[PDB]
């Protein structure tokens, strides 16, 4: 009776119960999805296993997206358990700490740029490509972005470049996978309460709804985009940010 | 446990079972909402009363948005039935025939421009303002737009200017009403009769959209039901494309 | 050798030496344009005649854009002086005061909305239409907008709607007039004399400074010239880069 | 009396008299700038010295942007001739053939992605940063982009992602360099005369019903490089006969 009843959805980047990924997993399970999860390094096997149990699942698989072999092995393993995949949630995203603090050029190096683009941008369509052989015709792929892709935000720096490439990959993936029937979207999420205070307070004071978004609100938006309720929606970057993107705040 | 359970929603622009408003009404009713409807002219009262009955409702009210007396009376009447309003769907718009055909300048006149903007853009925030005193604190207001607001589309002409002004009102309304808790959004819907040039747009979108298909009132209805609900509580000031991804490509090359 | 040499350009909206239109007039005259000017109300005839003389021109014409008769008489009048028009600068824009102060809904009325859209948006394509029979095939039409068209700015309110319609008219005009060869563009100018809005822009713009009417004027002159023959349907921000950031954090 | 009189400007990506960089070079020279040029590989030193000579210049320097040492050496060299630099034109951009033809996923590989972003996106702010110690306070940096950054265009594929990253770099650079006074912009240029189809479509559906020329892109570039554009930064200016602004072909 839930709006994702019978959908099988693989989620990446579940590291804690304050994750956007956790919020989405919770919303998805409530609406009747069956879930599977990735984790990075055998050191995190136990932790991810406990999360999966919370969501009524035993399906966890290692996947460091830096490694082509691991990406390919993920879907070979997953296919031994599921005949098809209906949803993928891409919620990973890394830049070296210097590359997203202080001045943009101070933190810029060829390697910092490379890693940021490889993990935060390349990995989405790499996963989509590796999943394609087992995707259902009406599957939905979801990634996460930030307003820093669209306008210059202090400190976001190299990550802003990488998220811009990510949101472009959303549009190109939509075209590539869409004749089959597969949809591809992103949520551009506002910051979540858990110098970053400057941002949280500013957003709370300047957003149209005068409040920060919660992982529950982002989770519900993601569940919607993963479902057949959203079958008319693809190639979209949906803002879930209390309307902050639509104003000139503070002015 | 429909996701709009207990919500009270007023819908404008329901003229047929092919209407975008009809699709939104069906989805809202499926998810547990109670519905009320508007109509223009006593000559449509019997027909909207029939449609309302189809959605288990007896609540219909005249509202020609060209007339301040009708806009100012609507929510006074509604209030006698419902103490508060949780949703409003604005799905109305008009421009004179010549203002949406051929060359943009040939069809341009002051009165054509005035009408198009009065009915298609001004009416949305006008209804919001009249509704304000009875809106629930978590109410949600939804309007409908088109890609012609964003980029120039053949024939759309003066309606493109009025949809741009409508999309701007979504952002300004979101700010005005947001502290209270009210959300304001638009759906930019793809094309959904026998109009030859419109048939060409439908064919182009089917061949060139990412999903290779035109959208349906069911798909637009569900998106609308979502934006109307607490599942969309983090979403305001948004223009959401429900158009098979068409706005995101350069088609035809 | 000026990049607008020979170009005949009509400018609306010149009310003082602080007007955006005055900066564009300066930049255009510097690059060799011949200039003509409009004014609203017989009361302002002498003061516009004086600005015109500063720019070496005697061509001044009444034009209240609310009045169809004035719009059509403007072009009948100008045609007796100039066989063809190479440029038009639309720098007019008005909303009743309550419609651009305070809360959006408090100032919303059907008549406030109608006036704001009629003067600030409809007048641009209306002037284009009246001008068309005398426009040179490579003419250039320029209007002025503001970031308030794109994102909700405090107090901008009904003018944010009007400027969104105006920017849309730039794209539809460009399509309508483009096969003949006429280009159509907008500059989205930063704020220009409130001290707090200006201070926020000075502190948060990438260039850490407010734009000047000399900077907007030069960008205008460029778009008016054949140097910009590849540019149409564009909304160019001339605002010290303020549109491109999230300030205040 | 040109509008770039006295400005010293460095141009990358000049490979032929049909290069966008050649058009921008012509316009800048016309407007009074002094030019310097980069080239890739010993193999091309002669052809660039010639082009340079066409524009009254003997300042040519090797610079493969895949290489940190070469980027740092360019400005070390340049400084021995120019005490300060007023403009930079970044007009380079590569993706492997497979990564910019056919289906997006067929051409996607990790290395294709890496190369496209490294040469077409990263290189711009990389040159900015290495130039910074000799940049004049009113300098202007310009890069070249394409509509495929904003919307999905057939075959553009991995390059669309790299151009999106480049355009974002324009906004971050503008903030980083703006307090000093340096401006940073992009021109999103239309295609210049599979590709035949693209040019035909633009000529049929653009508002001006014509493709843009390197002379039109050049004049826009010279403007953005000049003090005439001193109010303009963080901007992606379309020079594409209005094509970006329409839904063509319906
Ligand atoms: Cl007044």
3-state secondary structure chain B: CCCCCCCEEEECCCCCCCCHHHHHHHHHHHCCCEEEEEECCHHHHHHHHHHHHHCCCCCEEECCCCCHHHHHHHHHHHHCCCCCEEEEEECCCCCCHHHHCCCCCCCCCHHHHHHHHHHHHHHHHHHHHHHHHHEEEEEEEEEEECHHHCCECCCCCHHHHHHHHHHHHHHHHHHHHHCCCCEEEEEEECCCCCCHHHHHHHHHHHHHCCCCCCCCHHHHHHHHHHHHCHHHCCCCCEEEEECCCHHHECCCC
- Are A118 and D104 inside 8 Å of each other by CB? no
- Contact D118/A at CB under 8 A: yes
User: CA of D246, closest CA in chain B: separation in Å?
Assistant: 5
Q: How far apart are CA A40 and CA A94, in angstroms?
A: 13
Instruction: Say whether A24 counts as a known binding-site residue.
Output: no
Residue contacts between B and D (CB atoms, under 8 Å): 45
Burial category of C149 from C-beta neighbours within 10 Å (exposed 0-12, middle 13-18, buried 19 and up) = buried
Q: How far apart are CA B91 and CA B37, in angstroms?
A: 11
Burial category of C207 from C-beta neighbours within 10 Å (exposed 0-12, middle 13-18, buried 19 and up) = buried
CA distance to C176, C183, D249, per residue, from C180 (Å): 9, 9, 19
Rg (CA), chain C: 18
Give the three-class secondary structure for C76: helix
Q: Which residues of D touch A121 (CB under 8 A)?
A: 113, 117, 161, 165
Q: How far apart are CA D34 and CA A148, in angstroms?
A: 37
Q: Which residues contact A97 (CB under 8 A, 6 or more apart)?
A: none
Active site residues per annotation of D: 146, 156
- Contact A218/B at CB under 8 A: yes
- Are C172 and B149 inside 8 Å of each other by CB? no
Give the three-class secondary structure for D189: strand
Q: How many CB atoms lie within 10 A of CB B1?
A: 7
- Contact D180/C at CB under 8 A: no
User: CA of B120, closest CA in chain C: separation in Å?
Assistant: 12
Instruction: State the DSSP code for C190.
Output: P
Strands B85-90 and B8-11: parallel
What's the maximum distance between 2 C-alpha atoms anywhere in chain A? Answer: 56
Taking the C-alpha atoms of D240, A169, A150 and D218 in order, what is their torsion angle to the nearest 10 degrees? -20
User: CA of C51, closest CA in chain B: separation in Å?
Assistant: 31
- Residue C120 CA to ligand 1 center (angstroms) comes to 14
- Contact A139/B at CB under 8 A: no
| CA closest to C184 among chain D residues | D242
User: CA of D106, closest CA in chain C: separation in Å?
Assistant: 34
Q: Which CATH number fits domain B1-253: 3.40.50.450, 3.50.50.60, 3.40.50.300, 3.40.50.720?
A: 3.40.50.720
Instruction: Say whether D93 counts as a known binding-site residue.
Output: yes
Q: Which residues of D touch C215 (CB under 8 A)?
A: 230-232
Q: Which CATH number fits domain A1-251: 3.40.50.720, 3.30.70.260, 3.20.20.70, 1.10.10.10?
A: 3.40.50.720
Instruction: Say whether D95 counts as a known binding-site residue.
Output: yes
- Residue B169 CA to ligand 1 center (angstroms) comes to 21
Contacting chains of D (3 CB pairs or more, <8 Å) are A, B, C
- Edge-to-edge strands of the sheet including C34-39? C60-62, C34-39, C8-11, C85-90, C135-145, C183-189, C234-238
Number of alpha carbons in the 13 Å side-chain half-sphere of residue A159: 21
- Are B237 and A221 inside 8 Å of each other by CB? no
Secondary-structure class of domain D1-250 per CATH: alpha beta
Asked if residues A124 and A173 have their Cβ atoms less than 8 Å apart, the reply is yes
| CA closest to A168 among chain D residues | D161
- Contact B171/A at CB under 8 A: yes
- Residue C73 CA to ligand 1 center (angstroms) comes to 26
- Are C244 and A151 inside 8 Å of each other by CB? yes
Q: How far apart are CA D128 and CA D117, in angstroms?
A: 16
Instruction: Say whether C92 counts as a known binding-site residue.
Output: yes
Asked if residues C116 and C66 have their Cβ atoms less than 8 Å apart, the reply is no
Task: Give start and end residues of each alpha helix (H) in D118-207.
Answer: 123-131, 157-178, 195-205
- Contact B231/A at CB under 8 A: yes
- Are B105 and C149 inside 8 Å of each other by CB? no
- Residue C158 CA to ligand 1 center (angstroms) comes to 13
User: CA of B169, closest CA in chain A: separation in Å?
Assistant: 11
- Among D181, D207, D232, whose Cβ lies nearest the Cβ of C219? D232
Ramachandran sector of residue B244 (left: φ over 0; alpha: ψ -120 to 50; beta: rest): left
Q: How far apart are CA D211 and CA D202, in angstroms?
A: 6
Q: Which residues of D touch C174 (CB under 8 A)?
A: 207, 242, 245
CA distance to B20, B25, B52, B146, per residue, from B17 (Å): 9, 10, 12, 20
Asked if residues D99 and D157 have their Cβ atoms less than 8 Å apart, the reply is yes
What's the maximum distance between 2 C-alpha atoms anywhere in chain D? Answer: 57
The position carrying tokens 């009417």 is: C213
Q: How far apart are CA C55 and CA C65, in angstroms?
A: 24
Active site residues per annotation of B: 146, 156
Q: Could you tell me which of D237, D232, D188, D235 has the C-alpha nearest to residue C218?
A: D232
Task: Give start and end residues of each alpha helix (H) in chain C.
Answer: 20-30, 45-54, 68-79, 110-117, 123-131, 158-178, 195-204, 213-224
Q: How far apart are CA D207 and CA D247, in angstroms?
A: 11
Give me the residue spans of the domains in chain D: 1-250
- Are B249 and A171 inside 8 Å of each other by CB? yes
- Contact B105/C at CB under 8 A: yes
C212 token code pair: 């000047």
Q: How far apart are CA B141 and CA B228, in angstroms?
A: 7
- Contact A3/B at CB under 8 A: yes
| CA closest to B65 among chain C residues | C110
Q: How far apart are CA D185 and CA D144, in angstroms?
A: 9
| CA closest to D246 among chain B residues | B152
Q: Could you tell me which of A140, A50, A146 has the C-alpha nearest to residue A89?
A: A140
User: CA of B51, closest CA in chain C: separation in Å?
Assistant: 31
Handedness of CA D123, A112, C246, B169 (dihedral sign): positive
Preferred mutation among D144, D232, D243 to probe C, highest tally of C CBs within 10 A: D232
Q: Which residues of B touch A228 (CB under 8 A)?
A: 222
C200 token code pair: 């926020």
Residue contacts between A and B (CB atoms, under 8 Å): 123
User: CA of B95, closest CA in chain C: separation in Å?
Assistant: 14
Instruction: Say whether A41 counts as a known binding-site residue.
Output: no
Number of alpha carbons in the 13 Å side-chain half-sphere of residue D144: 26
Q: How far apart are CA B231 and CA B25, in angstroms?
A: 18
Instruction: Say whether D13 counts as a known binding-site residue.
Output: yes
Q: How far apart are CA B170 and CA A239, in angstroms?
A: 14
- Are C104 and B168 inside 8 Å of each other by CB? no
Q: Which residues of C touch D206 (CB under 8 A)?
A: 178
Return residues with CB closer than 5 A to ligand 1 (ion): C 96-97
Provide the β-strand partners of residue B135. B85
Q: Is A22 a catalytic residue?
A: no
What's the maximum distance between 2 C-alpha atoms anywhere in chain B? Answer: 57
Q: Which CATH number fits domain C1-249: 1.10.3720.10, 3.40.50.2300, 3.30.70.1230, 3.40.50.720?
A: 3.40.50.720
Instruction: State the DSSP code for C122.
Output: I
A113 token code pair: 């740029």
- Are D3 and C3 inside 8 Å of each other by CB? yes
Q: What angle do CA D88, D94, D95 make, to 5 degrees?
A: 150
Asked if residues B109 and C122 have their Cβ atoms less than 8 Å apart, the reply is no
Instruction: Say whether B237 counts as a known binding-site residue.
Output: no
Angle at which helix B123-131 crosses helix B158-178, to 10 degrees, equals: 20
Provide the β-strand partners of residue C11. C37, C89
- Are C249 and A152 inside 8 Å of each other by CB? no
Asked if residues C73 and C46 have their Cβ atoms less than 8 Å apart, the reply is no
Number of alpha carbons in the 13 Å side-chain half-sphere of residue C118: 19
C-alpha B186: how far from its chain's center? 7
- Among B223, B238, B249, whose Cβ lies nearest the Cβ of A232? B223
Helix (H) or strand (E) holding D87: strand D85-90
Strands B8-11 and D8-11: unpaired
Q: Which phi and psi (to 5°) does residue C182 adopt?
A: -80, 135
- Residue B118 CA to ligand 1 center (angstroms) comes to 20
- Contact D72/A at CB under 8 A: no
Number of alpha carbons in the 13 Å side-chain half-sphere of residue A7: 32
């Amino acid at each position: 009776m839930g709006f994702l009843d019978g959908k099988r959805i693989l989620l990446t980047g579940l590291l804690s119960n304050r994750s956007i990924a956790y919020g989405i997993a919770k919303a998805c399970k409530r609406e009747g999805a069956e879930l599977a999860f990735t984790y990075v390094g055998d050191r995190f096997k136990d932790r991810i296993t406990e999360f999966a149990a919370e969501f009524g699942s035993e399906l966890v698989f290692p996947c460091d997206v830096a490694d082509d072999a691991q990406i390919d092995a993920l879907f070979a393993s997953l296919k031994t358990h599921w005949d098809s995949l209906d949803g993928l949630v891409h919620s990973i995203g890394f830049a070296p700490r210097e590359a997203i603090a202080g001045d943009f050029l101070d933190g810029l190096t060829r390697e910092n740029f490379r890693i940021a683009h490889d993990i935060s941008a390349y990995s989405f369509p790499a996963l989509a490509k590796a999943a394609l052989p087992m995707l259902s015709d009406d599957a939905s792929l979801l990634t996460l972005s930030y307003l820093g892709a669209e306008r210059a935000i202090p400190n976001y720096n190299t990550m802003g470049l990488a998220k811009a490439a990510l949101e472009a990959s959303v549009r190109y993936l939509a075209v590539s996978l869409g004749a089959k029937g597969v949809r591809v979207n992103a949520i551009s999420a506002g910051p979540i309460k858990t110098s970053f205070g400057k941002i949280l307070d500013f957003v709370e004071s300047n957003s149209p709804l005068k409040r920060n978004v919660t992982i529950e609100q982002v989770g519900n938006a993601g569940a919607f985009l993963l479902s057949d309720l959203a079958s008319g929606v693809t190639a979209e970057v949906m803002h879930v940010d209390s309307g902050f993107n639509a104003v000139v705040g503070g002015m």
